[PDB]
From a paper:
Telacebec inhibits the mycobacterial respiratory supercomplex composed of complexes III and IV (CIII2CIV2). In mycobacterial electron transport chains, CIII2CIV2 replaces canonical CIII and CIV, transferring electrons from the intermediate carrier menaquinol to the final acceptor, molecular oxygen, while simultaneously transferring protons across the inner membrane to power ATP synthesis. Each CIII contains two sites where redox reactions with MQ occur: a QP site near the positive (periplasmic) side of the membrane where MQH2 is oxidized and a QN site near the negative (cytoplasmic) side of the membrane where MQ is reduced.
LpqE was observed in one previous structural study of CIII2CIV2 from M. smegmatis but was absent in another, presumably due to depletion of the subunit during purification of the supercomplex. Clashes between LpqE and the open conformation of cyt. cc suggest that LpqE prevents the open conformation. In the open conformation, heme cII from the cyt. cc domain is too far from CuA to allow electron transfer, leading to the hypothesis that switching between the closed and open conformations plays a role in controlling the flow of electrons through the supercomplex. The overall resolution of the map, which is somewhat better than in previous studies, allowed refinement of an atomic model for CIII2CIV2 including residues T82, E83, A123 to D131, and S183 from LpqE, and residues H57 to G78 from MSMEG_4693 (also known as CtaJ), which could not be modeled previously. The model shown in Figure 1D illustrates one cyt. cc domain in the closed position with LpqE present (right side: cyan and orange) and the other cyt. cc domain in the open position without LpqE (left side: cyan), although other combinations could also be modeled.
Numbering used by the authors:
A (entry chain J): 1 to 13, 22 to 50
B (entry chain Z): 1 to 139
C (entry chain K): 27 to 338
D (entry chain L): 10 to 561
E (entry chain b): 13 to 157
F (entry chain a): 1 to 79
G (entry chain X): 1 to 203
The structure:
């Protein structure tokens, strides 16, 4: 119990609405989280 | 732990008999007397089983019958606080890698790599052992 | 029927080989009887399918049959004890160690070929005033008065005061039938006589096995120091002709290229061969002189080339 | 009055939910899965080495292999299959179900068994890594006899990597033995007495003791060899008892090694017969004594692999070699008794389990033939011995392990392996196996010593070798149905929403959700007999299992 | 109260541990595994956009179809934002029900579209394909809360 | 002996046996129930399927309570 | 985080309550020591085979065992075992600092044993006998130096356990850790007694 729950306001800016989702990558909103599969295929 | 001790007691009896008969029938009826390899191996596996069985017997006499060792024991009897079992840990793989480094250093006779692998083994074993005792950072 | 039931065991050429083959036939008969009954049990309990007529009623659920367990743990002991008694009586004639061998062959096996010395020959009928040489058994005692240090060490040697590079255990003889990589060695032995083999290895363990002797031994580097009874005897060799022999323990890379021959010839042929070898001649020359093919007829010294696809 | 379940269970899982577990997993169930997957990878890698040997040996010439390349193949094939597939997978199965089968949540030291797996994996890799070196892997045989392994003979680095790779892998096996033996002794269900824990857990327990007795000797011997190779320590100098010292040291480990490889899968086979025969394991108390006797005898009958050396007390080891065959006979008869008068249903676990009986017996029957020194003389170090221990190993640690995999795939994945593909895999394996090795008895009976890279066309038994190669490639393709079955059944395939996909299960591992909850249980039944799960699922049988028991 | 006809027992806790004879299966769903997987994939990630739990009820829904649809939607874990499409081929009937939270997000406008998508495929003779198509159309219609 | 013959044998006998065994076994009716034909009546028990798509507050069952069905829509159709 | 979901003072506790049930760590360490006994069995087999194959004069002429130095180190190892047992007695109690004192002096005396073994090693080496120099020298060095490596590992375990006692509150788990370390040290001294009787007295 010698710990304090953290809370953070990260300045956001693509709107992560076409791509990866928190269900697939839990921290999608926290950073670059998805590379187009076309990039990996090519 | 009566049966647990008795298993090793039986193994010790058999291995002692095997060592004695091997030693006798090799001291006589062999090309060069006692073999001194099979004899020693049999004697010290008798010692293996003897040590384990003696400890188990000490424990059995020191312990009252557990639910595990007690026929006709209900689950609620043993229900209670089980002890600490280590959750997830990534120190075992580091220990294995350090020992592998030391092993390749021994195979390819590289004393520098042997020293590095031994240092890494010390570090990784220290990490594993201290994993659940390292206190919080004091700043 | 015996040949087929022997599972590809060559018909022996020695009394020991014949006796071993008979024991093998008996043991295989016993093993096949046991296997037949057990396979019958398995294929008969495979008739206990889950019959659709089986209603909501589980099987007899018995387990735990003490008398049956006792019977089936008594009978295997009887079977294996009979087999052990037969094994012991056959083993007794594995090395009779007759102190009067009729011909002694010093078989020294080095890395990837053989050499045969003809240590001694003493025919019972009376012949062959022959003997081994042994002037060349020279030791390698590293008993220098002083080593690197100034004094005190006076090192004698690592092992029993000698050096591992000793080779004194090896024995050498006047007539050496050394086998070259391109010439398969052909140890020639008289038929009908008792042949002792004194077995040794120059470098590494390997195994002298004449498949038609129905017997192999492991030529070790220092059998006497390893408590190994390298020397072993054969009471007789009835059939004449060339018999292949092979290496049957790991020698190195060319472990499969150590094949040799044990050509059994008549006693008069052996007389002529040994006389012609005492006279300056090679093994092939002596064989040709006694009118027998010089080169190993059961095997060839096959290609020294590493393989087929190597560009010559 | 109805549940909202997904149309199909989750196939694979979210991105990045597994990689970090493998690194940090302290769960025996996942570690056992890692063992099984990795062990099978070494089976395929080690098995591929035999196909190269098979292709080369199909014809008298040296078509594509060299003498030393072939020599490295059976060294590493024998090494990989035994020490990197057969011995590491007993603790793979132990970690898989042994805590489940005793009611425990985890193993005694679960960070230690994680270390054991990684010691196995990395130790195995450095041994196989002798191949990438220019010289090659260890050229000497798997037995690695003394003078041939000295620095003078086989001086390459691959031989050394092999020695140390076994030392690293050996430690993991020793530590794994400490967990299983400590887990059984200490961690057990509140009602599971030592004489009521399943036969497989008992078999692993005694196997662990054999591991502790045997493997440390190997590590001592390997270091002695490594000291001899790197320091000229004269430890195995032939002028000493070196040649017979190593054989005494190695086989004292070796023969227990071939029994720690055997006893665990006797338990697996013993776990599968009662569930599919719908009756108790015939003679439970006898099997545990038989297992105990085998382990006790295996230690003192080590030298029957050294009959040809002519340097051992020949009668002594033969007698105990005939004495250790009797307990294995009792075990074999008990398995038939379990099958006797039972409602047998030959699903893919029984199919493999019965195959073990057929293949093991013939290999076993040849085993006693080898126990006779006079017969062992001619047949020693020949392909008859190669045929012996393959009918016994493959029977014991391929047929049984596959039976264990097929039997316990639902209990670790929640999915059922396809029965049709399993039957195809078995018969390909069964037909393939008997083809490759049955003729090898005749092959070696007539003169053909093993570890022969090439043979003359004039030498007979050229037709047998091709027949053997045909069988091995039937075995080669037999692993395709299995890998396909597992590949398309791990993520797809008939899900099991119930305990005991094979009804009438025992051993208390069938008393929990087929994918077991972390810590193995949400419900521990009242353990009364050797069949807790059966007692739970069929309470009406509880009285009958006591009444009909004694009659036998 | 009675457990399954054979081999299923109530454990010390609530969970019932069941068994099946070795040959047979557990789910017994009368659909191919692959199109079951397809419908599961739809329900799972083709609905993540909707952020409302999509459910499919193939069972019969008799008497007043609408009301039975309501009280089977009640069984969805969170009916507040849930979309239950129920088809009874015993009655050739389709009924879609929505939770209070999933309302005004295009769900009401997507109901005829989803029902028509289901109906076309059903009259074509493909229950699972029709369910998948209806789920896809409805999930496209719904917007995240 | 007949290098080509031996190669063809070792390469083909496994393939022929595999094909035969696959025909014998893989062509057997599986345990999976046959697809439900629309014409036949619905004999299977009622099936309710759910996405498990969202996060359901706390994982533990207790505390969820029963807020209510709160039905907020409807539809109908007859194929 | 009201107080704790797990009502335990220590994040790390015994693996099972040792008062009623076996100490799991003790069981494991005892089994592992029983295995190390077989490791030393292999070493003993090597030594005894070399002794048997020696031609009467088992220690070659160049080698001369310095029993005058080998007896003090053996007595020091016995004393190390005794003081380690005293440290165990402290560990059974909550005597953190008593355990630390006993184990520190145990470590010091084990280090003295290692240094004395090294001194005898260099003395023997300069007096001819070396691993490549003789079969006796090689078997003796193999056995005694593998025991020395085990003693070094024991010293490492001692210092590691002391560091662990320095970083967390003493608990039954940590007392058990001390107990198993003491088991290892006792096994090491017992195998040393065996090796001493075999090398220096039996010869
Ligand atoms: C391909 C797959 C096979 C790979 C084979 C290689 C295996 C070895 C590499 C993995 C070992 C590290 C690991 O598993 O990741 C832990 C770590 C995650 O730890 P976490 O528990 O989730 O941390 C959460 C919080 O930070 C708080 O969590 P925390 O409380 O547990 O603390 C953070 C954790 C995190 O600590 C670390 O990250 C240490 C990283 C050690 C890397 C060792 C490299 C070995 C070379 C491998 C070559 C490949 O704790 C510490 O230990 C910090 C102290 C640092 C100790 C450094 C010890 C060096 C030991 C050297 C021994 C000699 C071995 C030679 C062989 O993973 C990483 O972040 C590092 C990435 C992996 C390293 C790649 C190496 C290249
Ligand atoms: C060079 C070394 C560098 C690293 C290795 C190179 C490749 C990098 C790939 C990443 C490695 C990895 O473990 O990440 C998993 C990675 C997937 O990432 P993830 O985080 O696991 O994703 C979570 C899953 O979606 C969801 O989780 P999940 O638990 O469902 O995982 C799915 C998977 C696995 O299910 C499991 O739970 C398996 C757990 C144990 C299996 C692996 C044990 C090995 C652990 C030792 C080292 C790994 C660290 O289930 C299967 O579908 C298994 C099919 C069985 C095949 C038939 C076997 C007979 O796998 C890959 O996509 C690559 C394959 C990984 C290994 C294959 C490459 C090795 C060489 C080929 C075969 C070797 C044979 C001999 C030659
Ligand atoms: C030969 C190869 C040597 C193998 C030696 C390791 C095998 C011992 C395993 C059985 C012992 C009982 C046990 O389960 O270990 C607990 C523990 C496993 O922890 P866990 O599974 O997570 O469960 C919690 C423990 O039960 C909770 O108990 P714990 O964590 O508190 O364990 C207590 C003692 C556990 O008791 C012991 O293990 C006694 C330590 C004696 C080993 C000394 C090495 C002798 C070999 C040197 C000659 C080669 O832990 C210590 O505080 C002392 C550890 C000192 C290890 C020093 C190894 C350094 C080797 C390099 C030496 C350099 C000189 C050569 C040049 O194992 C270890 O800590 C040993 C690490 C493995 C080292 C392998 C080296 C490669
Ligand atoms: C290249 C250059 C290398 C530079 C490395 C710097 C090393 C020395 C500086 C740090 C020492 C320090 O600040 O100590 C004061 C520090 C004061 O803070 P504390 O709160 O009392 O505890 C330390 C932590 O703050 C709080 O830690 P804790 O109380 O939680 O306990 C953790 C424990 C755990 O730390 C460990 O890792 C201990 C296990 C050591 C490895 C065991 C195997 C080693 C092989 C043994 C051989 C057997 C034969 O650490 C200690 O043992 C504490 C002593 C601190 C130094 C550690 C020794 C390194 O500790 C002391 O009371 C005095 C200890 C003096 C020992 C220092 C000796 C180390 C080498 C000196 C020469 C420098 C390297 C030259 C090359
Ligand atoms: C799982 C592995 C396994 C198992 C169970 C066995 C079991 C046995 N082995 Fe095995 N053996 C090996 C693996 C195994 N072996 C290996 C890997 C080698 C290496 C080859 C080498 O390097 O030399 C080897 C080598 C080997 C040799 C040396 C061959 C040689 O080098 O020339 C010999 C005997 O000489 C032998 C004997 C036996 C015997 C008597 C049994 C028996 O204990 C059990 C099997 C026999 C039975 C008979 C069981 C069936 C019994 C009944 C059905 C009861 C009724 C029947 C009778 C009473 C006959 N084995
Ligand atoms: C577990 C132990 C085990 C197993 C399973 C096997 C399996 C097989 N063994 Fe085994 N074998 C031994 C242990 C084992 N062997 C031992 C211990 C020796 C003695 C070694 C010595 O004396 O030094 C030996 C010796 C031995 C020899 C004698 C070598 C010689 O002396 O020259 C031969 C010859 O054919 C042989 C053949 C086979 C075959 C054909 C199989 C088959 O059953 C194997 C099945 C094959 C596969 C499963 C491969 C198919 C898969 C693929 C082709 C896919 C590859 C994919 C990847 C690599 C990713 N073995
Ligand atoms: C496996 C290790 C490798 C194989 C196994 C080795 C086991 C040995 C164990 C302990 C030995 C310690 C005592 C050694 C000291 C005894 C004296 C002596 O040895 O004699 C002097 C010689 C020179 O002799 P010289 O040239 O003829 O010149 C004479 C001058 N007149 O030094 C030497 O070679 C000795 C050097 C040996 C160093 C060994 C270090 C081992 C550390 C390995 C770490 C763990 C590896 C893990 C592997 C998985
Ligand atoms: Cu050879
Ligand atoms: Cu040779
Ligand atoms: Cu054996």
């Amino acid at each position: 119990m010698s710990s304090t729950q953290d809370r953070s306001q990260l300045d956001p800016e693509v709107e992560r609405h076409t791509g990866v989702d928190v269900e697939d990558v839990p921290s999608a909103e926290w950073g670059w989280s998805h590379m187009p599969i076309g990039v990996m295929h090519i | 732990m009566h049966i647990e001790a008795r298993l090793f007691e039986i193994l010790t009896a058999f291995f002692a008999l095997a060592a004695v008969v091997y030693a006798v029938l090799t001291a006589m009826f062999a090309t060069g007397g006692v073999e001194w390899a099979g004899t020693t191996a049999l004697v010290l596996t008798t010692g293996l089983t003897l040590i384990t069985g003696t400890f188990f017997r000490f424990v059995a006499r020191r312990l009252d019958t557990r639910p595990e060792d007690y026929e006709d024991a209900e689950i609620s009897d043993g229900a209670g606080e089980l002890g600490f079992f280590a959750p997830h840990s990534w120190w075992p793989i580091l220990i294995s890698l350090s020992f592998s480094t030391a092993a390749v250093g021994a195979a390819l006779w590289l004393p520098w790599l042997i020293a590095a692998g031994v240092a890494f083994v010390i570090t990784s074993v220290c990490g594993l052992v201290f994993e659940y005792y390292w206190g919080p950072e004091k700043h | 029927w015996s040949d087929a039931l022997a599972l590809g065991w060559p018909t022996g050429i020695t009394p020991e080989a014949k006796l071993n083959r008979e024991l093998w036939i008996g043991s295989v008969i016993a093993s096949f009887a046991v296997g037949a009954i057990v396979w019958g049990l398995i294929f008969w309990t495979s008739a206990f399918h889950r019959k659709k007529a089986t209603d909501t009623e589980l099987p007899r659920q018995f387990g735990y049959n003490m008398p049956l367990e006792l019977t089936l743990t008594v009978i295997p002991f009887l079977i294996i004890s009979v087999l052990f008694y037969f094994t012991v009586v056959v083993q007794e004639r594995m090395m009779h160690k007759d102190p009067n061998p009729e011909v002694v062959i010093d078989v020294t096996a080095f890395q990837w070929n053989w050499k045969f010395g003809y240590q001694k020959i003493a025919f019972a009928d009376g012949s062959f005033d022959y003997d081994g040489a042994d002037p060349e058994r020279k030791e390698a005692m590293t008993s220098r008065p002083e080593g690197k240090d100034e004094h005190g060490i006076e090192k004698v040697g690592p092992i029993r005061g000698m050096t591992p590079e000793d080779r004194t255990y090896l024995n050498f003889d006047k007539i050496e039938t050394l086998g070259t990589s391109s010439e398969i060695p052909v140890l020639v032995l008289p038929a009908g006589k008792r042949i002792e083999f004194v077995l040794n290895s120059a470098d590494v363990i390997h195994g002298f096995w004449v498949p038609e002797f129905l017997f192999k031994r492991d030529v070790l580097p220092e059998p006497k120091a390893n408590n190994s009874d390298n020397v072993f005897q054969v009471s007789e060799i009835q059939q004449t002709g060339a018999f292949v022999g092979r290496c049957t323990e790991m020698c190195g890379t060319f472990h499969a290229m150590m094949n040799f021959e044990v050509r059994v010839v008549e006693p008069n042929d052996f007389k002529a061969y040994i006389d012609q070898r005492n006279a300056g001649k090679t093994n092939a020359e002596a064989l040709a002189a006694i009118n027998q093919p010089p080169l190993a007829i059961t095997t060839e010294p096959f290609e020294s080339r590493r393989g087929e696809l190597v560009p010559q | 009055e109805l549940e909202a379940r997904r149309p199909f269970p989750e196939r694979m899982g979210p991105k990045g939910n597994l990689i970090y577990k493998l690194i940090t997993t302290t769960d025996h169930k996942l570690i056992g899965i890692m063992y099984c997957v990795v062990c099978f990878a070494f089976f395929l890698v080690g098995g591929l080495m035999a196909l190269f040997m098979r292709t080369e040996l199909a014809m008298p010439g040296l078509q594509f292999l060299s003498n030393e390349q072939f020599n490295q193949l059976f060294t590493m094939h024998g090494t990989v299959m035994l020490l990197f597939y057969a011995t590491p997978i007993v603790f793979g199965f132990a970690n898989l179900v042994l805590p489940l089968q005793i009611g425990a949540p985890d193993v005694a030291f679960p960070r230690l068994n994680a270390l054991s797996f990684w010691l196995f994996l990395f130790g195995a890799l450095i041994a196989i890594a002798g191949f990438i070196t220019p010289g090659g892997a260890a050229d000497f045989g798997w037995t690695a006899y003394s003078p041939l392994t000295d620095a003078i003979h086989s001086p390459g680095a691959g031989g050394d990597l092999w020695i140390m790779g076994l030392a690293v892998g050996g430690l993991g096996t020793i530590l794994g033995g400490v967990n299983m033996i400590t887990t059984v002794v200490c961690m057990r269900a509140p009602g599971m007495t030592m004489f009521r824990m399943p036969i497989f857990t008992w078999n692993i327990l005694v196997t662990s003791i054999l591991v502790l007795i045997a493997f440390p000797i190997l590590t001592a011997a390997l270091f002695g060899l490594a000291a001899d190779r790197h320091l000229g320590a004269h430890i195995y100098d032939p002028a000493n008892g070196g040649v017979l010292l190593w054989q005494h040291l190695f086989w004292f480990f070796g023969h227990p090694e071939v029994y720690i490889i055997a006893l665990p899968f006797f338990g697996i086979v013993s776990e599968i017969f009662p569930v599919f025969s719908r009756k108790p394991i015939f003679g439970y108390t006898t099997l545990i004594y038989a297992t105990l006797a085998i382990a006790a005898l295996s230690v003192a009958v080590w030298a029957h692999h050294m009959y040809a050396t002519g340097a051992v007390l020949l009668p002594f080891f033969s007698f105990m070699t005939f004495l250790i065959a009797v307990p294995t006979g009792i075990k074999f008869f008990n398995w038939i008794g379990t099958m006797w008068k039972g409602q047998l249903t030959f699903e893919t676990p029984m199919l493999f389990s019965v195959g073990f009986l057929i293949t093991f017996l013939l290999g076993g029957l040849s085993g006693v033939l080898l126990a006779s020194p006079p017969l062992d003389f001619h047949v020693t170090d020949s392909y008859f011995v190669i045929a012996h221990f393959h009918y016994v190993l493959f029977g014991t640690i391929v047929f049984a392990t596959y039976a264990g995999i097929y039997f316990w795939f639902p209990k670790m994945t929640g999915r059922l392996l396809d029965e049709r593909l399993g039957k195809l895999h078995f018969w390909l394996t069964f037909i393939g196996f008997h083809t490759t090795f049955l003729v090898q008895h005749w092959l070696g009976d007539e003169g053909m010593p093993r570890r022969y890279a090439d043979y003359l066309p004039t030498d007979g038994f050229t037709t047998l070798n091709v027949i053997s190669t045909v069988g091995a490639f039937i075995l080669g393709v037999s692993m395709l149905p299995f890998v396909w079955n597992v590949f398309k059944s791990w993520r797809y395939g008939e899900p099991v929403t119930v305990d005991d996909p094979w009804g009438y299960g025992n051993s208390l591992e069938w008393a929990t959700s087929c994918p077991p909850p972390r810590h193995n249980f949400t419900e521990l039944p009242r353990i009364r007999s050797e069949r807790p799960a059966f007692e739970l699922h069929y309470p009406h049988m509880v009285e009958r299992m006591r009444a009909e028991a004694h009659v036998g | 109260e009675l457990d399954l006809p054979y081999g299923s027992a109530l454990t010390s806790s609530g969970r019932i541990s069941a068994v099946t004879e070795p040959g047979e299966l557990s789910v017994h769903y009368p659909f191919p595994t692959m199109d079951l997987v397809v419908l599961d994939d739809a329900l799972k990630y083709g609905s993540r956009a909707a952020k409302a739990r999509f459910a499919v009820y193939i069972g019969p829904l008799g008497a007043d179809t609408a009301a039975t649809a309501r009280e089977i939607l009640a069984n969805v874990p969170t009916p507040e934002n849930a979309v239950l499409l129920a088809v009874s081929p015993d009655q050739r009937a389709i009924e879609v029900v929505y939770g209070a939270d999933v309302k005004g997000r295009g769900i009401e406008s997507a109901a005829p579209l989803g029902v028509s998508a289901a109906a076309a495929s059903f009259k074509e003779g493909n229950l699972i394909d029709g369910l998948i198509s209806a789920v896809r159309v409805m999930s496209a219609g719904v917007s995240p809360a | 002996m007949s290098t080509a013959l031996t190669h063809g044998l070792i390469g083909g006998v496994p393939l022929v046996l595999f094909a035969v065994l696959a025909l014998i076994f893989l062509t057997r009716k599986g345990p999976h129930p046959d697809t439900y034909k629309m014409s036949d009546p619905w004999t299977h028990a009622p099936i309710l399927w759910a996405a498990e798509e969202p996060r359901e507050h706390g994982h533990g069952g207790h505390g969820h309570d029963s807020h209510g069905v709160v039905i907020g829509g409807g539809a109908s159709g007859k194929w | 985080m009201t107080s704790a979901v797990g009502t335990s003072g220590t994040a790390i506790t015994s693996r099972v309550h040792s008062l009623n049930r076996p100490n799991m760590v003790s069981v494991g360490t005892i089994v592992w020591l029983s295995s190390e006994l077989m490791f030393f069995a292999g070493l003993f087999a090597m030594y005894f085979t070399a002794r048997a194959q020696a031609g009467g004069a088992w220690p070659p002429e160049p080698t001369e065992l310095n029993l005058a130095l080998a007896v003090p180190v053996t007595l020091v190892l016995i004393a190390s075992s005794f003081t380690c047992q005293m440290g165990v007695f402290a560990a059974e109690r909550g005597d953190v600092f008593g355990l630390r004192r006993w184990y520190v002096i145990t470590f010091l005396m084990g280090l003295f044993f290692v240094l004395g073994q090294g001194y005898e090693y260099i003395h023997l080496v300069e007096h001819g006998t070396t691993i490549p120099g003789s079969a006796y020298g090689s078997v003796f060095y193999l056995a005694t130096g593998f025991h020395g490596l085990h003693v070094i590992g024991g010293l490492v375990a001692f210092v590691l356990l002391l560091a662990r006692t320095k970083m967390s509150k003493f608990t039954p788990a940590q007392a058990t850790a001390a107990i198993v370390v003491s088991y290892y040290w006792h096994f090491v001294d017992i195998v040393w007694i065996a090796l001493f009787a075999t090398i220096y007295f039996v010869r």
